Amino acid sequence: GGYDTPLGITNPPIDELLDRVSSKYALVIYAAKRARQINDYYNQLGEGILEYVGPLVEPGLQEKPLSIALREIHADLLEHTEG
Amino acid sequence: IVDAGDRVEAGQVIADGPCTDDGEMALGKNLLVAIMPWEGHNYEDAIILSNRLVEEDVLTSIHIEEHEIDARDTKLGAEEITRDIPNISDEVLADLDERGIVRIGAEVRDGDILVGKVTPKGETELTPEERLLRAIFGEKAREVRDTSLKVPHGESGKVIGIRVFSREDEDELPAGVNELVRVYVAQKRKISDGDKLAGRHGNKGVIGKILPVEDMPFLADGTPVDIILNTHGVPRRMNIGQILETHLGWCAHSGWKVDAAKGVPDWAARLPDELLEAQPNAIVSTPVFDGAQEAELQGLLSCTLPNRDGDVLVDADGKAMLFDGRSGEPFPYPVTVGYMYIMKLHHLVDDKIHARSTGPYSMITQQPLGGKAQFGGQRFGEMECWAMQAYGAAYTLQELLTIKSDDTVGRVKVYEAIVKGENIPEPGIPESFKVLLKELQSLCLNVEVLSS
Amino acid sequence: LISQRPTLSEDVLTDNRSQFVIEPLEPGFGYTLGNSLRRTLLSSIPGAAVTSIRIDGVLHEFTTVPGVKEDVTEIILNLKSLVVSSEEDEPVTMYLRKQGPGEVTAGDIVPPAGVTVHNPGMHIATLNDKGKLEVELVVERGRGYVPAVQNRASGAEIGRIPVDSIYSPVLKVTYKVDATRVEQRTDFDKLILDVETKNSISPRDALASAGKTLVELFGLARELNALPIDDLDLTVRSYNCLKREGVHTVGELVARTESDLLDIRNFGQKSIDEVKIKLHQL
Amino acid sequence: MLISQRPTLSEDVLTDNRSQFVIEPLEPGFGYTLGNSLRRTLLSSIPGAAVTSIRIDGVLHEFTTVPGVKEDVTEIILNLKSLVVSSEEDEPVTMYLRKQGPGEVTAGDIVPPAGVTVHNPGMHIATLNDKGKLEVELVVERGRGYVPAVQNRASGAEIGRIPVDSIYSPVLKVTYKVDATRVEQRTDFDKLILDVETKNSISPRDALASAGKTLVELFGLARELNVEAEGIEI
Amino acid sequence: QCGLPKLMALELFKPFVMKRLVDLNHAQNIKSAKRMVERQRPQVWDVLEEVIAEHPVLLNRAPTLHRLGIQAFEPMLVEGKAIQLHPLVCEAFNADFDGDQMAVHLPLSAEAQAEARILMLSSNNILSPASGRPLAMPRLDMVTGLYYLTTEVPGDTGEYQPASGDHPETGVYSSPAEAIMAADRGVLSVRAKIKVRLTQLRPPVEIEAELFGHSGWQPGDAWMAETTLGRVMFNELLPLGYPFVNKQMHKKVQAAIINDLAERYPMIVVAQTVDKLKDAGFYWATRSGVTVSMADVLVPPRKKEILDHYEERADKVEKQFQRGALNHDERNEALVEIWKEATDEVGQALREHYPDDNPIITIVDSGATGNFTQTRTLAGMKGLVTNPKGEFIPRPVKSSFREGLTVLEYFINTHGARKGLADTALRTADSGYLTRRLVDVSQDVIVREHDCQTERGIVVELAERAPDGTLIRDPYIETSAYARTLGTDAVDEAGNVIVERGQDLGDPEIDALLAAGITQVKVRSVLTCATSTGVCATCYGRSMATGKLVDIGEAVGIVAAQSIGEPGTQLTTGGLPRVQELFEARVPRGKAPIADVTGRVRLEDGERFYKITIVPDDGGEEVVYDKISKRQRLRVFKRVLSDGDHVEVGQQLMEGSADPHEVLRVQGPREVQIHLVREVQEVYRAQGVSIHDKHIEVIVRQMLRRVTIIDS
Ligand SMILES: [Mg+2]
Ligand SMILES: [Zn+2]
């Protein structure tokens, strides 16, 4: 908590993401799958809503799905099962 | 370099060439140089320069590039150079004369047309959509395909002159070619960050940052320094000769006079005559091995007659007090300043910047081409693959190998997804692997793939 | 422990060079003040310069005019050292025509009224018997350094030759400080700032412009911090007086005092009484 | 001319008396020009009152410590130096603070005469015990900037008069930096960031305004020589 | 962050910006979007910035010697055509700004983007995987500036001197703000020792304990620090919770403190601290007043007398040779040794005379550039110059570069320089081939499971004892002991358990073991991992880059191969050929016979081929070694080799290099593992490169995975 406000890409601190997941590769797959779901929801939103759910946190003006997903992970809003 | 009435003897220089001044080779310019570090913009062999070098055109070069295109007879007839290009706008033809060649002196930029040449293509397989477009816009036959000469992507400039060759005018050409046109394009390239400057002692360096003239160190007289080099590169590389040259250049620029009130000093005893008194901005020659001694140069630095008023900016040991151009406080310790010969090398960033999103591909294997002649494509080699594997990131390696290089359907689908907004699709089988499989099969080797 | 206001003095050394003394100042303030003044003078002093030229016999900068020993590019570079002073903001055209064997300088160029050339003795080119020079220079105001504007940016023809512009009449600015540093804490910094301009503006005026520019941003920092009388049911004489003379509303009556209203001739005592009681009421 | 926009300053507070100012957008190269001058003006232009010399009975030439209290002469000088005062009169005022027996001698037991104020009485100064008897005489005067201790002229009259450094400037620590926001579209202007920490006597906003009128009247003295001048509009 | 050219970024992100500008209705369709992108319309950069925003892009410089040679960054748009790199990643990239170019690649999908922005972020890669030392150190200029800011100059302006009777110490400051005010005035210097009151920085452990008792909530309270203003500024740059350092900061000191930060602080905070340190060092480098001039380099006054004395000695030995008392080889050896003595004396005189404030000495001592051999060659005399055959010319170069060289002196110097320039060019390709072979042989092993639950391990010396009785620290502990896992519990004299099994065995654990007094420690290594495929995490040990235990999918083999192959170009058979022959398991050129049985030795000086016999101390058989060369000396052990000295089963009786196959066949696989690891480590460390033992252990484990069948 001694750090200052992170800038840009490192806005969600990497360590705070690490303690919520098993390992770095698991975190990467976490973020990738969530970004895939969010992008699918964004593309398909015009038609009937499918099982995919949009961003749980409030998206920014023009925010990347990957960063939105990482913010969701930091907020502790999703759960995963490993292989 | 001569006048209208002066006499000239045999062997005298009459006109100077590209890198010659008054008949002697001059590959660079004399710049006022300080050799202290500055804010890290000169960190690790980087070089800092004033904006007055950009302004006064101190370091500018004329670069002329030629472009060639020829009209040659083909099985379908003879391609012709003409300003009548089918299905093109009218504004783009403004710089083309009635001959179809860009007018001399017309400024040109990337993507423009230099020579208007069209070839007889007749017709090919027209898709139903193309037929509909032709028949709805009421286009005429548009019987020819315009393979006109366009400027290469990444440069611009003015047009100097045009040479036109045609076999109808007795001009000899290679067999099959009835017209040849070459267009000369020149750019007055200015100094910029990324360009490579160098000295005469192997102290090369790129330009980290071009500073405003106000925000640079300046002596007590107010003259800003023209170039700043880091001080950590000199002692490590053992090129003290550059500092010796800097001191001697400052001495020559300032001028000197040895006070022979009571005989010449001991260090100047063996110093040749006509060297005891030099006017400001004088030129001196130092032979490589019978050069100026350290004691002689120290004495010359000692006698360093003032510039305009009574003021000796440079002290006995060749240093001076500099005022910081940003904070304004005087620098705590004197730093060495002088005049150094700096040359601009032929490593301009304009000739090295390259980028590619999607271009041509090779025939045998579908990998992208290489080099700035084509559209390029970076070489992701075995060492890069090893680093990718060491990082543990498999998806990026799979993408760099499959859908960016070889998989044709992968490339098409990834472009379609990236334009339509959907996520990137799954990579497929690279074409190079299939090529290798067929090559192995051609060697009478029964190689196959088993799914279970 | 100095509380008196600072003061400014000027001392001219030459028509261009000059030396301004600022005193007294707080200790350490002199260096920063001189640096700020120098940085503003060297960058943000408006001036005027020639931006584009045109020779009849050329089409681009990389040609040669027939008959003149000088080249086009080196003629441009020689023209780079021209100092001027314009009074009109819009682009202004001046002409230079010479013919015959001679050294054409900046004294053979005719400036239209409202602008001034200041260095006519500077060398431009050298011609021969067949030499003939005819050029047109377009000049505009500005500030700082502006590179050559692209020909395609404007509606310029082939013959127009864009040239770099340097609107900077300040040539060389430097400073020094004299510090007392006395043991009774009456220590002050006397700032001596010497300025030299390229004969196009007085350094006095250059510092005036620099000061105006500075006080712009520093003042930005500062600013943080009715009825008509007849409607009163009056009588014959009062109605006649207000109609002939032109007094219409009771606003002017409540503005006018008793002395200012009793000045009228043939004034009625009943009118005075009613105006007094009605001003007491309303 | 015109600067194509309106350069403005925006302030956000961090503590009770500590602020960050952002001035944006300026002409290129003006960030340092404003920042250095503003920092110097804040540091050494704001008038303020401070302690100059002290005199404590019980010590004449022994400077190691004083009886009763446990904090020695150097530490007590440090605490008195780190004390904020405000005086409305130029001449040096004299303060007296006396305490007896065990206790926590703070700035609240001081007695200020009329026209002078102490802006934080809740400052620990001394810890007296064992029949402690503390009596401190202070000299408070108004100046500007930071002034090192001056050798006392009244050495014969006041042998025990120990001079101390004077923090005349109300501001404590001011720093600045520049950045190059909006480089591509807005042709690379720059923004200036100031971080100001001051005593509780005055606030950063009016401290900046005071530096403002100092600099404005200085440069107006400079400029009020050729009124017909050409510059830039906001 | 990295600065990307706007034209380069536009070309790279062309489909992205085209789709975005079509969405923003700037163009009606993709054809118009492409047209306006190609013509570079003004309405393109505004959307290009939004497209670029927070999209990771990865830079790479050829060759990629190790894993850190290709790193991801968040790009901005900068006018120009040159990529702006952060100065700190220069060490990791092995990149300098003399003209070297870099390439850039764009990750497209969510998987690739997440991988680049998580695994490959530069701020996420500080420590070197090979040696654990951080690669984000402040480099030359930054360490010079920090050294200047931190060094304490006695008798400087504004110092603190205690006084009494007339005035107090008049050198004590109430706050760092007052100290900064004084430094702004001329009264106080940055490098002047004073006493100040600190209310934010934690004091060192000793004073903190002895002053505040148990509770050390110092960033709230206040204390007195006897130090310099520069050290106060440095500690302000450091994180608030870090204890005060109060010492002049060498490059080694900076490495130690940054390593400690990475050990016990978050990655984000250590990256921010490194950035702040870089900024401060760059700011203070200019004010250090470090510059090189003609007067800065000084010559020793005793140089002429020393040279005359050694020339007299050379004349004496030359006359003795002329009399016929010695041959040309003896004359050359005598001249070489006397001129080496002359060079040493001249260097010592120069060091003694040279002041400690000169810029050259400051740069050399701060750890930024070069060293004293470079300094002596610059000012002093270069000395012996190599022949093109590698020999030494009897006549050395008496002058120096400061005074200028003569024609023949420059000729011999050019001889040596050309030889070096050719050998480095060959060595680059040789090292590339070596690392290619290493990675191709070691790509098999990866971490496959958390723990294989084995018990067998490796014995580590861990600061062996001394004859007088004490625990002298082993010179190589960070290479071997640090970042490992315990195989068995550590007990001192069958007493209390010091550190439990399965521990990371870091600095506190090693300190506790040394305090207890035990040296031989059992450890878990990949050489004895019981996993069928790959290795388990615990046996491999702590990941030596991230500072924690390795993950369950790391390519440890590839990491080890890259770590070993990266410093090859720094090597200079006792170098790269030696390590290549060690890794190829060939018979060494200096074949040293190995003993075959513990027994008594008997040695006879034969006709240039000695005869060695080992008689076993049991009912064994006398072993014989006959065909040897007289050029090889006699190996020393225990002392010196003596005839009749009983020797062990595997004692090397001859100096040189033993045969790996023979040592394996005579002392099992554990001894050959020890021999290979020690030989490779000593070859690498003889040049100044530290590599953790686990990489060589992985390579050796892959070496020894087979068995040769004797009977069908
Ligand atoms: Mg380099
Ligand atoms: Zn295991």
Curated annotation (Swiss-Prot), chain A:
E.C. numbers: 2.7.7.6
EC category: transferase
Keywords, alphabetical: DNA-directed RNA polymerase, Nucleotidyltransferase, Transcription, Transferase
Reactions performed catalytically: RNA(n) + a ribonucleoside 5'-triphosphate = RNA(n+1) + diphosphate
Domain of life assignment: Bacteria
Coiled-coil stretches: none
GO cellular component: cytosol; cytosolic DNA-directed RNA polymerase complex; peptidoglycan-based cell wall
A biological process from GO: DNA-templated transcription initiation
Molecular function GO terms recorded: bacterial-type RNA polymerase core enzyme binding; DNA binding; DNA-directed RNA polymerase activity
Family: Belongs to the RNA polymerase subunit omega family.
Assembly with partners or alone: The RNAP catalytic core consists of 2 alpha, 1 beta, 1 beta' and 1 omega subunit. When a sigma factor is associated with the core the holoenzyme is formed, which can initiate transcription.
Function according to Swiss-Prot or TrEMBL: Promotes RNA polymerase assembly. Latches the N- and C-terminal regions of the beta' subunit thereby facilitating its interaction with the beta and alpha subunits.
Protein name: DNA-directed RNA polymerase subunit omega
Organism from which the protein derives: Mycobacterium tuberculosis (strain ATCC 25618 / H37Rv)
Portion of the full sequence shown: 27 to 109 of 110
From Swiss-Prot, chain B:
Protein's recorded name: DNA-directed RNA polymerase subunit beta
Organism: Mycobacterium tuberculosis (strain ATCC 25618 / H37Rv)
Recorded superkingdom: Bacteria
Subunit structure: The RNAP catalytic core consists of 2 alpha, 1 beta, 1 beta' and 1 omega subunit. When a sigma factor is associated with the core the holoenzyme is formed, which can initiate transcription. Interacts with CarD, TRCF (Mfd) and RbpA.
Family membership noted in the UniProt record: Belongs to the RNA polymerase beta chain family.
Transmembrane segments: none
Role summary: DNA-dependent RNA polymerase catalyzes the transcription of DNA into RNA using the four ribonucleoside triphosphates as substrates.
UniProtKB/Swiss-Prot annotation, chain D:
EC assignment: 2.7.7.6
Reaction it catalyzes: RNA(n) + a ribonucleoside 5'-triphosphate = RNA(n+1) + diphosphate
Induction: 3-fold repressed by starvation.
Gene Ontology biological process terms, A to Z: DNA-templated transcription
Keywords: DNA-directed RNA polymerase, Nucleotidyltransferase, Transcription, Transferase
Entry GO MF terms: DNA binding; DNA-directed RNA polymerase activity; protein dimerization activity
Family per similarity comment: Belongs to the RNA polymerase alpha chain family.
Domain-related comment: The N-terminal domain is essential for RNAP assembly and basal transcription, whereas the C-terminal domain is involved in interaction with transcriptional regulators and with upstream promoter elements.
Function, in words: DNA-dependent RNA polymerase catalyzes the transcription of DNA into RNA using the four ribonucleoside triphosphates as substrates.
Protein name: DNA-directed RNA polymerase subunit alpha
Provenance organism: Mycobacterium tuberculosis (strain ATCC 25618 / H37Rv)
Gene name per UniProt: rpoA
Shown stretch of the complete protein: 1 to 234 of 347
UniProtKB/Swiss-Prot annotation, chain E:
Reported function: DNA-dependent RNA polymerase catalyzes the transcription of DNA into RNA using the four ribonucleoside triphosphates as substrates.
Annotated protein name in UniProt: DNA-directed RNA polymerase subunit beta'
GO CC terms: cytosol; DNA-directed RNA polymerase complex; peptidoglycan-based cell wall; plasma membrane
Recorded name of the encoding gene: rpoC
Induction (free text): 6-fold repressed by starvation.
Cofactor: Mg(2+); Zn(2+)
Keywords: DNA-directed RNA polymerase, Magnesium, Metal-binding, Nucleotidyltransferase, Transcription, Transferase, Zinc
Entire-sequence positions represented here: 440 to 1170 of 1316
Family to which this protein belongs: Belongs to the RNA polymerase beta' chain family.
Superkingdom of origin organism: Bacteria
Subunit structure comment from the entry: The RNAP catalytic core consists of 2 alpha, 1 beta, 1 beta' and 1 omega subunit. When a sigma factor is associated with the core the holoenzyme is formed, which can initiate transcription.
